[PDB]
């Protein structure tokens, strides 16, 4: 541990620009780092996977927030074959006036981009109807992204580090991931479809404030 990169003495003593490039390129090759053991490899991998989850949740929450803030989801709901959905607004100080005129589309009051990811159709099929719902979804995903970082920080402290033999229990991991991660998630999504989206496809609005009273089926 002398200078950047702290994880490689061979690169850290290199006196050329090659120190910098290679330092970037070998950052995530944990097996090649100095004085690495087998246990630290698994623990660092666990923390990094939590990081990937946090980033994914942030990406989705950003999509929801920007669509709610600057999109035309409510307008698109009423005329889905002739209205173009809006991804996000444009604010470019390099633009000229003809471009400002040309990019104003979709019924908006300013230049916009049209979305081709298909998130409007997806979010309409699963029962979302207003901008308030989108805002609540974005906030919930923002909470999950923070939960991922907190868990990653917690499982990297001496009291809470799993041992090497924990990571090599194949039978237990297979049982938990087959039964719980795949099956139970499917059960929960089926429940969502029965309680929320299918009623929404018939004119019934079920939310967190009245879902207990309404019955998904008349005979229960």
């Amino acid at each position: 541990e002398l200078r950047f990169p702290r994880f490689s003495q061979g690169l850290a003593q290199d006196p050329t620009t090659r120190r910098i490039w290679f330092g970037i390129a070998t950052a995530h090759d944990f097996e090649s780092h100095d004085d690495i053991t087998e246990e630290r490899l698994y623990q660092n991998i666990f923390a990094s996977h939590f990081g990937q989850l946090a980033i994914i949740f942030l990406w989705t929450s950003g999509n929801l927030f920007h669509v709610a803030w600057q999109g035309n989801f409510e307008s698109w709901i009423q005329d889905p074959l002739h209205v173009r959905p809006i991804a996000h607004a444009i604010w470019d100080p390099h633009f000229g006036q003809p471009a400002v005129e040309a990019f104003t589309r979709g019924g908006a009051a300013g230049p916009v981009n049209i979305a081709y990811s298909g998130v409007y159709q997806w979010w309409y099929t699963i029962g979302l109807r207003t901008n308030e719902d989108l805002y609540t979804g974005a906030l919930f995903l923002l909470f999950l992204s923070t939960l991922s970082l907190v868990a990653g920080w917690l499982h990297l402290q001496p009291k809470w580090k799993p041992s090497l033999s924990w990571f090599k229990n194949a039978e237990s991991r297979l049982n938990h991931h087959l039964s719980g991660l795949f099956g139970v998630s499917s059960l929960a999504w089926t429940g969502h479809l029965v309680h929320v989206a299918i009623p929404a496809s018939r004119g019934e609005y079920v939310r967190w404030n009245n879902f207990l009273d309404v019955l998904p089926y008349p005979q229960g």
Partner: protein, 80 residues
């Protein structure tokens, strides 16, 4: 610095020593071959890693081997 190694299949022909452009190698007495000599690599801090020595060796497979390692001013051949 690079690493250079000599294996006991050497026949002591001396071609690798003659081929080196920075004087890394030299010949020393031995009793394992008919020529009564074998190569040696005592100055590997001056090796540039050109592999002319491997090009010169006649045995199959090679008797002198070069493994590239951490780079220095001497091993990158920088005059500035």
């Amino acid at each position: 610095s690079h690493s250079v190694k000599i294996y006991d299949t050497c026949i002591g022909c001396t071609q690798c020593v003659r081929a080196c452009p920075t004087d890394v190698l030299e010949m020393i007495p031995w009793d394992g071959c008919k020529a009564k000599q074998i190569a040696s690599a005592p100055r590997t801090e001056d090796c540039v890693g050109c592999k002319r020595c491997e090009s010169a060796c006649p045995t199959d497979f090679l008797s002198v081997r070069v493994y590239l390692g951490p780079e220095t001013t001497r091993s990158m051949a920088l005059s500035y």
